[PDB]
Design a protein around this ligand. Structure first.
Ligand code: HEM
Ligand code: HEM
Ligand code: HEM
Ligand code: HEM
Lengths: 145, 139, 145, 139
């Protein structure tokens, strides 16, 4: 549940987001800050140091796909379950990712947005984004419910 | 904390300096707006934007964190009195320490772009989780 | 979300449950095991010792109301959101209970059932009850989403 | 742990005695059925009811917990080798330690009705959360 003001503030800031770099930074920081997430990405190569993680080309490329799904979600806020149906099935039945990790990635993305926009990422702007990431996490965890 | 984490925390907090109080007040404001459940612990407070009470309380939080950085090897002893207050007297739900820690990280990311590297982000998250563990130790 | 076998096993055991005592024991144990929950129940009286908590008449009376809502949920498993609509609004907007505590109460209830039934509370029986308590917790947290 | 909690844990574990291994194997079986995500950590294991591998592993878990009860004042040192294995080698998600702790509590409630009082339930939950904190300390 987003108010019309909150919806317009989220959409306005998202149009300024560099998709080619924000995604790679959010995925990279999840692997560095929460090291247990690395076991799901063994086939991505060298993840031994923070510098090796941030410089990994497979991490950067995958990050773009993650942000693409978030963009799709922002275009269909009224129907999040439908927009993430197959992705929920993939993460649950094939990868077996604990749903708590969806909340962690959402929070890391919020940190990355604050880092990229500075004082433009105001407390009301953060409040609306927290509602979005929680909605995305809940829609991804549906096939577990 | 590991030696690498101690060095990262001391270096990042040194750059914060005289702005600690300001960052503490902003982190509290971010928490109240993003997580409205946290507001129930402050009914006697003026919670509007730019509140003198929030500014004053943000300074006290920042002073406790600055003291924890200086006593990083003896955190349970330095924060002992604060554990009794938050757990026994105020009965603060442990989930709220995670919510405030996240809001402090968002505040630092917005004010220190050159300092908030992935390595420093990881060390500050570990430091704040250690502070939270000490403050909920009486449970 | 429950198989016909799981549904019959949950229903059979629930008919044996003493509503007048199981509810009071589940609510009482939440207050003893997770002491921060006591701040929401200050007006209930003496909560100083585990024996004072378990023997408190307001804790016992309230526990019956909690179990009554669970019984209602078991009768409408396909529509959990509708069955808990107003209760979700109450816990969120009026009481401001963090949704993590709904999971804790669900888990404490599972412990109370195991204590009361012993070897009859088998691992497949627990697995079906875990699905139920997770569903109830999720339906109560809807007005936050 | 507080002195009251230490006394409750030692008294409850004494009653468990020679059945610790049995209770450990049952707790694992309860975890695999209730939380299927936990099964991915054991692809090389026979996970069927009454498995010899699950019985053997349940004994090892119970032995580690029995050693933790005897070394309750020095838990980080006694469980140091297990922290490296679970965090560095196996990369076990911290949420899974809560899932196993809950299943151990359900197992004890079903086998020790006279011993599983509200006070003992609270102490055993605090002991298992301390064990979980030590096993995830390398994160
Ligand atoms: C919470 C937001 C998340 C979103 C929106 C998301 C989205 C995606 C998307 C779009 C894909 C691509 C699927 C394809 O191309 O067929 C993907 C793959 C995957 N995701 Fe996520 N994901 C999220 C969280 C997570 C988390 C928390 C983990 C684990 C820690 C995870 C692990 C994976 C893995 C392992 C793959 C497969 C990569 C491969 O095939 O090599 N995801 N995710
Ligand atoms: C990083 C974690 C935290 C630190 C370092 C911290 C620090 C402090 C300090 C230093 C005080 C003042 C103590 C005094 O003057 O005697 C205080 C008071 C208080 N804290 Fe915290 N705190 C933290 C987290 C929290 C959280 C998460 C909450 C609840 C959401 C909370 C609620 C309070 C309340 C209600 C008071 C009393 C305010 C008053 O009545 O004046 N604190 N805290
Ligand atoms: C998760 C399952 C839960 C269910 C099914 C549930 C159900 C209920 C029900 C039916 C009521 C009665 C409302 C009325 O009579 O109008 C109630 C009241 C309440 N619940 Fe819950 N509840 C749950 C969890 C919680 C938790 C975890 C807390 C806090 C830790 C909580 C705190 C309260 C409080 C404070 C009240 C009001 C009591 C009063 O008026 O004095 N509930 N709950
Ligand atoms: C109460 C917490 C736990 C205790 C005390 C515990 C104890 C142990 C012990 C003693 C070992 C054998 C070490 C050796 O032989 O060198 C072990 C192995 C292992 N544990 Fe845990 N463990 C716990 C929780 C977990 C959890 C939550 C998981 C994941 C769901 C897990 C997954 C494993 C795995 C995969 C192994 C290796 C099994 C093998 O390859 O043979 N453990 N654990």
């Amino acid at each position: 549940h987003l108010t019309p003001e909150e919806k317009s503030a989220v959409t306005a800031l998202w149009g300024k987001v560099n998709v080619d770099e924000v995604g790679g930074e959010a995925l990279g920081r999840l692997l560095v800050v929460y090291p247990w997430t690395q076991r799901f990405f063994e086939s991505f190569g060298d993840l031994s140091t923070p510098d090796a993680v941030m410089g990994n080309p497979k991490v950067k490329a995958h990050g773009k796909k993650v942000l693409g799904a978030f963009s799709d979600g922002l275009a269909h806020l009224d129907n999040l379950k439908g927009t993430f149906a197959t992705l929920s099935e993939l993460h649950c039945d094939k990868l077996h990712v604990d749903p708590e990790n969806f909340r962690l990635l959402g929070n890391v993305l919020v940190c990355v947005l604050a880092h990229h926009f500075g004082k433009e990422f105001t407390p009301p702007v953060q409040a609306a984004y927290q509602k979005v990431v929680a909605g995305v996490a809940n829609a991804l965890a549906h096939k577990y419910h | 904390l590991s030696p690498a984490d101690k060095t990262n925390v001391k270096a990042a907090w040194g750059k914060v300096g005289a702005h600690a109080g300001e960052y503490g007040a902003e982190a509290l404001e971010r928490m109240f707006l993003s997580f409205p459940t946290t507001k129930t612990y402050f009914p006697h407070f003026d919670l509007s934007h730019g509140s003198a009470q929030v500014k004053g309380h943000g300074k006290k939080v920042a002073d406790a964190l600055t003291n924890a950085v200086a006593h990083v090897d003896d955190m349970p002893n330095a924060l002992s009195a604060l554990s009794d207050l938050h757990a026994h007297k105020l009965r603060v739900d442990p989930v709220n320490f995670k919510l405030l820690s996240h809001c402090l990280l968002v505040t630092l990311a917005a004010h220190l772009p050159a300092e908030f590297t992935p390595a420093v982000h990881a060390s500050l998250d570990k430091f704040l989780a250690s502070v939270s563990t000490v403050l909920t130790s009486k449970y």
